[PDB]
């Protein structure tokens, strides 16, 4: 993969654990999306 | 379900289940549960 899209927040049941990927793919979320994702 | 990892008080000794079914969980949430268990 190259870059994760910002619409993972729209996914209700997908996690970093669920979306298991290499870490350089994990590092790709926008900052507000990080704020919304660390709080799920 | 992965939502079992959302429970803070639950740990490995609390969550008594078969090894394969426990392994169905994602690796990192299992690591979180392990770390909350042993300390």
Swiss-Prot record, chain A:
Phenotypic consequence of gene deletion: Mice do not show remarkable changes in body weight or the weight of white adipose tissue on a chow diet, but display significantly lower body weights and fat mass than wild-type mice when fed a high-fat diet. Moreover, improved insulin resistance induced by the high-fat diet is observed.
LRR repeats: 13-36
Induction, as annotated: Induced during the earliest stages of adipogenesis.
Compartment annotation: Cell membrane; Endoplasmic reticulum membrane
Tissue specificity comment: Expressed at very low levels in adipose tissue.
Comment on protein domains: The volume-regulated anion channel (VRAC) channel forms a trimer of dimers, with symmetry mismatch between the pore-forming domain and the cytosolic LRR repeats, a topology similar to gap junction proteins. The cytoplasmic N-terminus preceding the first transmembrane (residues 1-22) regulates volume-regulated anion channel (VRAC) conductance, ion permeability and inactivation gating.
Role this protein plays: Non-essential component of the volume-regulated anion channel (VRAC, also named VSOAC channel), an anion channel required to maintain a constant cell volume in response to extracellular or intracellular osmotic changes. The VRAC channel conducts iodide better than chloride and can also conduct organic osmolytes like taurine. Plays a redundant role in the efflux of amino acids, such as aspartate and glutamate, in response to osmotic stress.
Assembly behavior: Heterohexamer; oligomerizes with other LRRC8 proteins (LRRC8A, LRRC8B, LRRC8D and/or LRRC8E) to form a heterohexamer. Homoheptamer; inactive, likely because it is not targeted to the plasma membrane in the absence of LRRC8A. In vivo, the subunit composition may depend primarily on expression levels, and heterooligomeric channels containing various proportions of the different LRRC8 proteins may coexist.
Record-stated family: Belongs to the LRRC8 family.
Protein name: Volume-regulated anion channel subunit LRRC8C
Curated annotation (Swiss-Prot), chain B:
Tissue occurrence: Ubiquitously expressed. High levels detected in the bone marrow; lower levels found in peripheral blood cells. Highly expressed in pancreatic beta cells.
Subcellular location: Cell membrane; Lysosome membrane
Modification note: N-glycosylated.
LRR repeat spans: 9-32
UniProt note: phenotype after gene disruption: Increased prenatal and postnatal mortality, growth retardation, and multiple tissue abnormalities. B-cell development is slightly impaired, without affecting B-cell function. Mice however show a cell-autonomous early block in thymocyte development and impairs peripheral T-cell expansion and function. Conditional deletion in germ cells leads to abnormal sperm and male infertility: the cytoplasm of late spermatids appears swollen, preventing reduction of the cytoplasm during further development into spermatozoa.
Associated pathology: Defects in Lrrc8a are the cause of ebouriffe (ebo), a spontaneous mutation that causes male sterility. Spermatozoa present in the epididymis display severe malformations, mostly of the tail. A drastic decrease of the spermatid population is observed, whereas spermatogonia and spermatocytes seem moderately affected. Defects are caused by decreased volume-regulated anion channel (VRAC) activity in germ cells. Oogenesis is not affected but embryos derived from ebo/ebo females show early developmental failure.
Domain notes: The volume-regulated anion channel (VRAC) channel forms a trimer of dimers, with symmetry mismatch between the pore-forming domain and the cytosolic LRR repeats, a topology similar to gap junction proteins. The di-leucine motif is required for lysosomal localization.
Record family assignment: Belongs to the LRRC8 family.
Function in brief: Essential component of the volume-regulated anion channel (VRAC, also named VSOAC channel), an anion channel required to maintain a constant cell volume in response to extracellular or intracellular osmotic changes. The VRAC channel conducts iodide better than chloride and can also conduct organic osmolytes like taurine. Mediates efflux of amino acids, such as aspartate and glutamate, in response to osmotic stress.
Quaternary structure (record): Heterohexamer; oligomerizes with other LRRC8 proteins (LRRC8B, LRRC8C, LRRC8D and/or LRRC8E) to form a heterohexamer. Can form homohexamers in vitro, but these have lower conductance than heterohexamers. In vivo, the subunit composition may depend primarily on expression levels, and heterooligomeric channels containing various proportions of the different LRRC8 proteins may coexist. Interact with GRB2. Interacts with NOX4; this interaction prevents the ubiquitin-mediated degradation of LRRC8A.
Protein's UniProt name: Volume-regulated anion channel subunit LRRC8A
